Amino acid sequence: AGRIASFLKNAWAKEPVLVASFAIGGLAIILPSLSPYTNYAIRINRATPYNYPVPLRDDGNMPDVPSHPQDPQGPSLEWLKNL
Amino acid sequence: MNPIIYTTLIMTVMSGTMLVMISSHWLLIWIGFEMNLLAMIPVLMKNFNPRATEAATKYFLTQATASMMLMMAIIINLLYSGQWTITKMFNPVAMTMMTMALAMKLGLSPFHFWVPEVTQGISLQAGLLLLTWQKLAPLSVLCQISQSINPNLMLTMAMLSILIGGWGGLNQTQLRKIMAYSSIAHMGWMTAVLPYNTTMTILNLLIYITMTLAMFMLLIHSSATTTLSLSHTWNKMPVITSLMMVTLLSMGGLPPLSGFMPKWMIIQEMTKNESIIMPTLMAMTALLNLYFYMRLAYSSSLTMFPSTNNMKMKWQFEHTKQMKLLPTMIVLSTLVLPMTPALSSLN
Amino acid sequence: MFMINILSLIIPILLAVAFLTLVERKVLGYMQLRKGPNVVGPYGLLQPIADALKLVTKEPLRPGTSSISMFIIAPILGLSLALTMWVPLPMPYPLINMNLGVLFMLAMSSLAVYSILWSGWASNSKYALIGALRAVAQTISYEVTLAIILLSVLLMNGSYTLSTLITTQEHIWMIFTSWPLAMMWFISTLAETNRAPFDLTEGESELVSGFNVEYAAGPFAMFFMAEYANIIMMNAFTAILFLGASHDPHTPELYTINFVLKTLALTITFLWIRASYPRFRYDQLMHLLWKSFLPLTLALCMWHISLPIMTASIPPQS
Amino acid sequence: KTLLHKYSDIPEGTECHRKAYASTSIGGATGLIVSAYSIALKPPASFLEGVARTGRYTFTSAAIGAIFGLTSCISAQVREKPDDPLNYFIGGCAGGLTLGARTRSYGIGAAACAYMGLTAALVKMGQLEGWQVFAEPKV
Amino acid sequence: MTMYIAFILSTIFVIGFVGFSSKPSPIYGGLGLIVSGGVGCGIVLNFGGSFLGLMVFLIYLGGMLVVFGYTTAMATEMYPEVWVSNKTVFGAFVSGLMMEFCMVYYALKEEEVEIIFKFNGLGDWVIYDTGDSGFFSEEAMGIAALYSYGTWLVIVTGWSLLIGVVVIMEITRGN
Amino acid sequence: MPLVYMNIIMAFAIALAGLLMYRSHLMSSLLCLEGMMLSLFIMSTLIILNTHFTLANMMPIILLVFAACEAALGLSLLVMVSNTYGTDYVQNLNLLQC
Amino acid sequence: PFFDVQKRLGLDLDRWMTIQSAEQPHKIPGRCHAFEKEWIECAHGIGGIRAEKECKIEFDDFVECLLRQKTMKRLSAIKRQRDKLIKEGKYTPPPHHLG
Amino acid sequence: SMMKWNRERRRLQIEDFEARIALMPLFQAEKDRRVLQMLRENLEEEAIIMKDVPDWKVGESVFHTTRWVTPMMGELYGLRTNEEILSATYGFIWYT
Amino acid sequence: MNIMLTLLTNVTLASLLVLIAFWLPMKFFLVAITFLLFDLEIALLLPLPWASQTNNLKTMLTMALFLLILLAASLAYEWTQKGLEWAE
Amino acid sequence: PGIVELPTLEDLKVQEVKVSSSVLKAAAHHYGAQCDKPNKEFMLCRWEEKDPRRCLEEGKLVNQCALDFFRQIKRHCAEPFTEYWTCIDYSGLQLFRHCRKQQAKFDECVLDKLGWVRPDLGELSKVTKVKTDRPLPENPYHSRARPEPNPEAEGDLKPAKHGSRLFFWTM
Numbered sequence A: 001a002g003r004i005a006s007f008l009k010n011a012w013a014k015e016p017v018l019v020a021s022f023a024i025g026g027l028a029i030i031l032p033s034l035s036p037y038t039n040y041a042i043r044i045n046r047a048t049p050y051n052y053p054v055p056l057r058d059d060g061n062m063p064d065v066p067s068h069p070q071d072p073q074g075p076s077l078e079w080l081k082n083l
Numbered sequence B: 001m002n003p004i005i006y007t008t009l010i011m012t013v014m015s016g017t018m019l020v021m022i023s024s025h026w027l028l029i030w031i032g033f034e035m036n037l038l039a040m041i042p043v044l045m046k047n048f049n050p051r052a053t054e055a056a057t058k059y060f061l062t063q064a065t066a067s068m069m070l071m072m073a074i075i076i077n078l079l080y081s082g083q084w085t086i087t088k089m090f091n092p093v094a095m096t097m098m099t100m101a102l103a104m105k106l107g108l109s110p111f112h113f114w115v116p117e118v119t120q121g122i123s124l125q126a127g128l129l130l131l132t133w134q135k136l137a138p139l140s141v142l143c144q145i146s147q148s149i150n151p152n153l154m155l156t157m158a159m160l161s162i163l164i165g166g167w168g169g170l171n172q173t174q175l176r177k178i179m180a181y182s183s184i185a186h187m188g189w190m191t192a193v194l195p196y197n198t199t200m201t202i203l204n205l206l207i208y209i210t211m212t213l214a215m216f217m218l219l220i221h222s223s224a225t226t227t228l229s230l231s232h233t234w235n236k237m238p239v240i241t242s243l244m245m246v247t248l249l250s251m252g253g254l255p256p257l258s259g260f261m262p263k264w265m266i267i268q269e270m271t272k273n274e275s276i277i278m279p280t281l282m283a284m285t286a287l288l289n290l291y292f293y294m295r296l297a298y299s300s301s302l303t304m305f306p307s308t309n310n311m312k313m314k315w316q317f318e319h320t321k322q323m324k325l326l327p328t329m330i331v332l333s334t335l336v337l338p339m340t341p342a343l344s345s346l347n
Numbered sequence C: 001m002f003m004i005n006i007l008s009l010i011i012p013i014l015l016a017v018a019f020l021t022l023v024e025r026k027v028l029g030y031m032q033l034r035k036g037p038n039v040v041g042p043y044g045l046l047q048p049i050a051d052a053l054k055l056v057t058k059e060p061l062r063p064g065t066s067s068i069s070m071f072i073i074a075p076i077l078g079l080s081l082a083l084t085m086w087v088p089l090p091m092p093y094p095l096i097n098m099n100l101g102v103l104f105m106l107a108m109s110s111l112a113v114y115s116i117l118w119s120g121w122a123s124n125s126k127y128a129l130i131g132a133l134r135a136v137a138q139t140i141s142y143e144v145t146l147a148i149i150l151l152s153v154l155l156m157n158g159s160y161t162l163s164t165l166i167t168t169q170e171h172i173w174m175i176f177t178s179w180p181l182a183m184m185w186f187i188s189t190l191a192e193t194n195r196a197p198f199d200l201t202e203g204e205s206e207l208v209s210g211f212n213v214e215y216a217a218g219p220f221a222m223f224f225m226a227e228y229a230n231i232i233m234m235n236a237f238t239a240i241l242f243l244g245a246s247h248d249p250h251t252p253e254l255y256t257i258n259f260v261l262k263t264l265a266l267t268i269t270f271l272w273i274r275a276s277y278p279r280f281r282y283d284q285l286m287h288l289l290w291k292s293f294l295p296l297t298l299a300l301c302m303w304h305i306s307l308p309i310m311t312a313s314i315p316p317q318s
Numbered sequence D: 001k002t003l004l005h006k007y008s009d010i011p012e013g014t015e016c017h018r019k020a021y022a023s024t025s026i027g028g029a030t031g032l033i034v035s036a037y038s039i040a041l042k043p044p045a046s047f048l049e050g051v052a053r054t055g056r057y058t059f060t061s062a063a064i065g066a067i068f069g070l071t072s073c074i075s076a077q078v079r080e081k082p083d084d085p086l087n088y089f090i091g092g093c094a095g096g097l098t099l100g101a102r103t104r105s106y107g108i109g110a111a112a113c114a115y116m117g118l119t120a121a122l123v124k125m126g127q128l129e130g131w132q133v134f135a136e137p138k139v
Numbered sequence E: 001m002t003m004y005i006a007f008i009l010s011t012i013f014v015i016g017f018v019g020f021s022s023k024p025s026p027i028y029g030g031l032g033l034i035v036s037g038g039v040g041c042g043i044v045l046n047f048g049g050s051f052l053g054l055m056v057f058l059i060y061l062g063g064m065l066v067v068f069g070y071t072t073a074m075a076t077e078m079y080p081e082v083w084v085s086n087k088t089v090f091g092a093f094v095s096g097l098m099m100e101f102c103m104v105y106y107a108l109k110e111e112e113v114e115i116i117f118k119f120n121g122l123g124d125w126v127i128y129d130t131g132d133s134g135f136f137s138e139e140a141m142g143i144a145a146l147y148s149y150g151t152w153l154v155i156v157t158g159w160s161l162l163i164g165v166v167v168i169m170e171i172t173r174g175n
Numbered sequence F: 001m002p003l004v005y006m007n008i009i010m011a012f013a014i015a016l017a018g019l020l021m022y023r024s025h026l027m028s029s030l031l032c033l034e035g036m037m038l039s040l041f042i043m044s045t046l047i048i049l050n051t052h053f054t055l056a057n058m059m060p061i062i063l064l065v066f067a068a069c070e071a072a073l074g075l076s077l078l079v080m081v082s083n084t085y086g087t088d089y090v091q092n093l094n095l096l097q098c
Numbered sequence G: 001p002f003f004d005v006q007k008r009l010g011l012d013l014d015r016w017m018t019i020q021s022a023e024q025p026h027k028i029p030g031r032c033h034a035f036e037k038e039w040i041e042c043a044h045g046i047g048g049i050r051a052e053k054e055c056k057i058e059f060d061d062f063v064e065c066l067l068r069q070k071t072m073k074r075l076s077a078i079k080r081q082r083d084k085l086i087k088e089g090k091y092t093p094p095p096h097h098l099g
Numbered sequence H: 001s002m003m004k005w006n007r008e009r010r011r012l013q014i015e016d017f018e019a020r021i022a023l024m025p026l027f028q029a030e031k032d033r034r035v036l037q038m039l040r041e042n043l044e045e046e047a048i049i050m051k052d053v054p055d056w057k058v059g060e061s062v063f064h065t066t067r068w069v070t071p072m073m074g075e076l077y078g079l080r081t082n083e084e085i086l087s088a089t090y091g092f093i094w095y096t
Numbered sequence I: 001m002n003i004m005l006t007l008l009t010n011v012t013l014a015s016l017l018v019l020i021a022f023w024l025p026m027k028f029f030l031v032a033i034t035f036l037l038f039d040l041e042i043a044l045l046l047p048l049p050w051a052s053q054t055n056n057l058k059t060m061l062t063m064a065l066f067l068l069i070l071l072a073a074s075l076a077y078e079w080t081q082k083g084l085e086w087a088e
Numbered sequence J: 001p002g003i004v005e006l007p008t009l010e011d012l013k014v015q016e017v018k019v020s021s022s023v024l025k026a027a028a029h030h031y032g033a034q035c036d037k038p039n040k041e042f043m044l045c046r047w048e049e050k051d052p053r054r055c056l057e058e059g060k061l062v063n064q065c066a067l068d069f070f071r072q073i074k075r076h077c078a079e080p081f082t083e084y085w086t087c088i089d090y091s092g093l094q095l096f097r098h099c100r101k102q103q104a105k106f107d108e109c110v111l112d113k114l115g116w117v118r119p120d121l122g123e124l125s126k127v128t129k130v131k132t133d134r135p136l137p138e139n140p141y142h143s144r145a146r147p148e149p150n151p152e153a154e155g156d157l158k159p160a161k162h163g164s165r166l167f168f169w170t171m
């Protein structure tokens, strides 16, 4: 560890450039996994609608889908509102 | 070429050709062809001699346009069909474009003109890859689209291949050049039945690859490139020349040698399809292949050409190359004829 | 009334470019203890008119060993794009609202090297050939970093719609988020601009003339305006990218005032660097980017794509 | 195969003028093909030499077809038998004599009659029994 | 006029192709294709291909052909040519446009051109389709699927282009 | 088949003819090699953009990324023969006679 | 393919793009998705020989959809007859053809 | 600051888009009547123009199927004047 | 309409400005090829801004760095094996 | 190939809305949340029937139901509505973030005079169980019959009779 820490500082002396970029790429590639928000990003990305939410024929016994757009039934993105 | 870089570059050609046979998308078929082309050029330029540059330039100039012509019939077929799946072509002129484009990537018709010199210019090992591994990737496409190719166009190009390939071999000296003309003649043999039956095309491929790879890279063991140079090898290694004649006689296709495997099976299928003039002329010009095959065997082992005094030096030494997979490859390329029902396995 | 709008965009820059030569030499002189042009009119305010009325009356001498077709076209498209650059600029309301303006802007920026190419070739001189050789290769080599820098920058902004730039930059300057890109972007222009230390395109004291070659009088005029109107452009391109402003829908006047001042400040800084610094060397010119700028730009681009997904800050442009 | 239909449509032993002109066209058509290739692989001298090469190659090929079509058809008329394969042989090899005439070699002319006549006879058999050279894939 | 903008762009495309494929001096040959690349964008743009057409303006047209112009600088013939310098190139240029001119004449008369394929000489605008694209910009979201649906295409593009750099410096290594 | 499609494929056809009509300059042939991939790109784009084959917009770029890759090696090949022959003239590109 | 490694492994490599009736970004339909559905559904488990003769009506309707050819022949003769009938001055176009 | 502002703009997008989804049913009906009014005009003119042509029955199908097909614009707007053709095809592409 | 009209008028003024002032009075190749390859790879990640709005950005995420890694890797090879260091 | 019979000009005279985009988008959410009954089944008709001609009856109803909503505002706080929609147009994007104060004024008026609440975020973007009377089409694409698949291969494998049977080879 002493020589490795010496080598890393050895790098920083004779060159400050590629060590900084190697650091930048190193973090930018690892934090994606260690993230509490990347799940929100895909949830946000899918939340935005580009197409009409095609209605389905009501044959009865539809538990969760609403009948009115203001009905409480259905998915709510309130988690985005406080976000 | 650093061995690590050399190994990677061959792997890309290994990968590029493998991509063609595993792709179901027309683009992906063209995709690996371009990668395969992109990787061989440095392999051919192994010695950087001016002749090697000439060979690489000729190979690139005749193959890049074929890939460009390859893409042309893809979009035209897309234009008239709208599907990229590797299937029958639903537009005639596209496939008329297709067969010529695939063939000139290979070279059977006048398209074949690049094969002789390009083989000569590149090194003997580099000549092997171009002539025993580059014939699978175009054949992979032709096998898949064999359902609807125009029989008139394909058979004519197959006729010209064996007719031009055998005829030019007679007047050739550099063993690399006889190799190219021998390959041109055999490619017409394997692709002649391609519209009729696909299984015996692949039969010829495995059979032709084994003998061609064995006798190419055995010729590397002899370390010779000219008929006179190959002639001298009887004094040093007479076993090599004796093995040279066996595959040379197999190369012609004299029973019971395994080189008669394709020639026999091809005539059987064309006869089954009522095409009987087609095989007879196809069989006749195969005698031209045997003539320069027999001439080379004459100068190699069947007689003894004069040697040189300085060659006594070589007797005290030995080869260092380990002839990877060579010894077994003669055995299954000259004696596998009794194992003829193995055809059904390829189906 | 579209034609008057085009003229209202073409006339000012030509009047600016001629009048920018005044301040350039004069601001350079004032950081050299000089006064600059001040004897011709009030505070020299007439020199822009003098040179604009002198290189157009000087007799243009075509090279003996040259094809005048290239000798004429190379000046023309050297400048014509520099005026076309201002077409999609989102000065409050851009002239053309190209949804892919940034790519269109970079397309003509890449077209500029062609005016470098035939101009050096057509004159057919040892200085002309080598002067072209270094100039175009330097510009294309620094274009690859230009492409990456934007790719990192507008990724937070959204698409390449230059009009959206005002919307995203609405509470803080984009430089406050990507200031390591700012120095990456600003300096990378200094070569495409053919400006300060990256001056090997022309080489004042050791190459006589480079990009402009010997093209004189007529060909000189719009070759002079070629990378002079461009300077005002990528001064404005940076002034809209990072150092943004505010845009009130009921008063677009404030946006222009902020935009022109920041662009003008950037132009002065170009002149600030013009003579203050020494000149780079071509070996170091390529050394700087492919070995320092490129590896650092690549990592920063890698950081600037992950970051919106790190914090769910992807743009709503689409 | 418009030219091929042009020839084969004419019944044997009649319309000899049409059969001859069709024979010239087929012989002429292959003249351009061989001459165009010859100019390509072997670069000739200035254009007048190139067309001189082209003229010679086309002339022989047209001439071989011209006399062959004439004699192959009148033989059926004179001998009153169109079906016989010999009806093509007696003119099929005379083209070899024509080739020898334009090349000035007795040996090559006689040998060409040995070969071309046999092939011309073979072509007649091909049309009679139902031979196919480029047969469609049947099995 | 305005109604024929795709037709007029297409015929300028052909004459640009004829001029540069007739093989004038290579630096002039580049220009003959550069304008063809320039008018090629208009056809793509007019059909909704805003990104793809503009993409061709940055790479290739403003990219790789710069290297072609670069290559013709140091590795050039001592006397670069021109359509006046040689007679064959002059003849090729006239033949190409005459062939094009005779073709559009055939297209304008009966619109029943059968050569190779069966063409129709009607207006260029007919082939368009009617229908809103919503808010997604069709083309823009089509090539944005490079990283959502691209899959195999991504690695092979990366690998071949990476293999594009092992090959280059190896062949220009000087033994 | 409209006229706009025709003008592109015909441009490809004349591009194909000039490619294999090598004059005494390899660069010109390389330039005429440059024609088809652009013609292929244009021809592909009109088909794909017209028919709203959304995913197929892949291939136009995919066509260009590798069809330019031969040009990467081809130019170096051209400079290679110009480093030993000192000339891109193709008449001297016949050393492989025998 | 020659060696259909996709079927054995079960991983989709290029099948996603092979036709435009597969999944598309944000459910954007192809210009001829309806006819692709009909032709593909007509020709499955039938082979490449039977389908080319049996499922021909679907193909003919579809092959017209991509590059609409027969309908321009419909449109071209509409334009030709309309031009002829106005050149000599018999048919008067309605005002709805204009403002 | 950019992260907080960008999230607000995403909420703006769904606010903007939600209006469009409510708007679309009216537009679908408007375009449906507009497009089918025009095709009604198209074959109404077809009867008058084409009667001497020997078997040119009005409104012949081109697709063998009886299912509705999105009409090609070349016959929707095609029979109209040159101006509205130009403003429609290259209208969105050209408006800038 | 406005696009090519703007191009037309810009060309006319620039062309006039010269006419009114005309009548009235291995290393270089090597880096260029590397530029072409990097510039071409740049075309790959250009559509990234739209690609950041897909519903499976995870696959978009990892594969986008893969292009940037390979640009880094291609630079690394061209760096160490002399290469980018110019010939002497 | 047949007849392309399409509805006459008689039924294509609906009381088309004469408003512009800004006033259409100014209400939008309230119109969407108060006229969903004729919107949902008409759009469902557009998808299920896959043909514009068969949904003309629902096509006129949605336009007609728009008028009842629109003139309801006129008998109410239409003056705040006019100030709103005359401020939206001034922005080139027709964006709500620059007209929040008039957004309130329209909302506060419509909140008590009529009661149409402001649809919360994401409420409109919701699949709904719209009730309908028409039966689903038996084949929306009017697909014809299907070719009979080839007979399935079956039967236990049996050794090849007399072996390979290829020329003289046996076993």
Ligand SMILES: CCCCCCCCCCCCCCCCCC(=O)OC[C@H](COP(=O)([O-])OCC[N+](C)(C)C)OC(=O)CCCCCCCCCCCCCCCCC
Pocket (backbone or CB within 6 Å): A015, A017, A020, A024, C179, C180, C181, C182, C183, C184, C186, C187, C197, C273, C277, C287, C288, C291, C292, C293, C296, C303
């Ligand atoms: C979680 C955090 C994520 C992000 C963190 C990012 C890392 C931390 C920040 C690092 C610094 C910023 C990025 C790097 C910038 C420097 C790049 C570089 O190569 O530097 C060394 C280089 C010199 O490097 P060198 O040549 O000494 O060494 C490089 C390595 N070798 C030797 C192997 C080649 O600096 C320069 O080139 C200086 C500039 C030269 C051009 C002349 C003009 C300069 C004008 C300066 C004044 C105006 C500034 C305007 C700024 C913009 C205004 C809008």
Ligand SMILES: CCCCCCCCCCCCCCCCCC(=O)OC[C@H](COP(=O)(O)OCCN)OC(=O)CCCCCCCCCCCCCCCCC
Pocket (backbone or CB within 6 Å): B237, B238, B239, B240, B242, B245, B246, B301, B302
């Ligand atoms: C199908 C048609 C025919 C095909 C084959 C035709 C072959 C000959 C064709 C003509 C060839 C050209 C003319 C002659 C060339 C001679 C080549 C040569 O190298 O000759 C000299 C050489 C000297 O011998 P040397 O290499 O020292 O080896 C001696 C044995 N150790 O000699 C040799 O190298 C020869 C070595 C021969 C080794 C024989 C090994 C026999 C093994 C017997 C195993 C028995 C097992 C019994 C089992 C019983 C229970 C089942």
Ligand SMILES: CCCCCCCCCCCCCCCCCC(=O)OC[C@H](COP(=O)(O)OCCN)OC(=O)CCCCCCCCCCCCCCCCC
Pocket (backbone or CB within 6 Å): D004, D007, D023, D026, D027, D030, D034, D038, D056, D057, D058, D060, D061, D064, D065, D068, D069, D095, D103
């Ligand atoms: C029933 C229907 C048909 C009726 C008409 C009969 C058939 C058509 C006429 C006969 C065609 C075959 C006979 C040969 C024709 C070409 C002859 C020719 O080109 O002669 C010129 C030349 C010979 O001399 P050369 O080798 O050049 O050497 C001296 C150089 N100073 O040779 C050359 O320059 C060319 C090289 C030698 C010849 C090569 C082979 C040419 C013929 C190929 C087969 C053509 C078959 C045509 C008929 C069937 C198909 C329709």
